[PDB]
């Protein structure tokens, strides 16, 4: 039902992406189908977040070594410190690199994980909950008002398609994928 709901509810491309990351880390979306809702959803917050803005390089959703290319490419041209970790998006206007976390808890709580696994980088923080709620770095939510409630609109809409098919339960709880 999961993965049916899944094929169903995000478009090809997103799916092919998130499938074939698992796949490849020896992770089936058959079995880990709660994983692979929540990789498609984070994907599409990240290509949503850029769609936004070229103000923004899509830096997630790319192989890894294409990923480093985009990356070491930012910081040769613009001096910004190498991250640890690649983030999900670049910010030409900003000048930061931005991470982007979709939680089922609490923003607070999944902001404090993100802000303590990338300590020592400079990367700008945005939480998206399945609730409305968000948390960004000194409160600076990078996008406008509008570009914000399509996201969490979209994540809502979701957690309610989940809903409807009895997953939201199973989902909310499995904080895999995060
Ligand atoms: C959990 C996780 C979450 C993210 O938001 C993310 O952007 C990412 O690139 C990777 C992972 C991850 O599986 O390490
Ligand atoms: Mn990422
Ligand atoms: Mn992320």
Redesign the pocket.
Known sequence: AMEDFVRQCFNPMIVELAEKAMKEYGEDPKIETNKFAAICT?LEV?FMYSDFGHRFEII?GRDRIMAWTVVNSICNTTGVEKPK????LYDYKENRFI????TRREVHIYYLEKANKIKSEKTHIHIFSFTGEEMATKADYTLDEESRARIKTRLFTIRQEMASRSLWDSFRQSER??
């Open positions: 984070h990240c997630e970790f690649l983030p999900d991470e982007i976390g979709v994928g995060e």
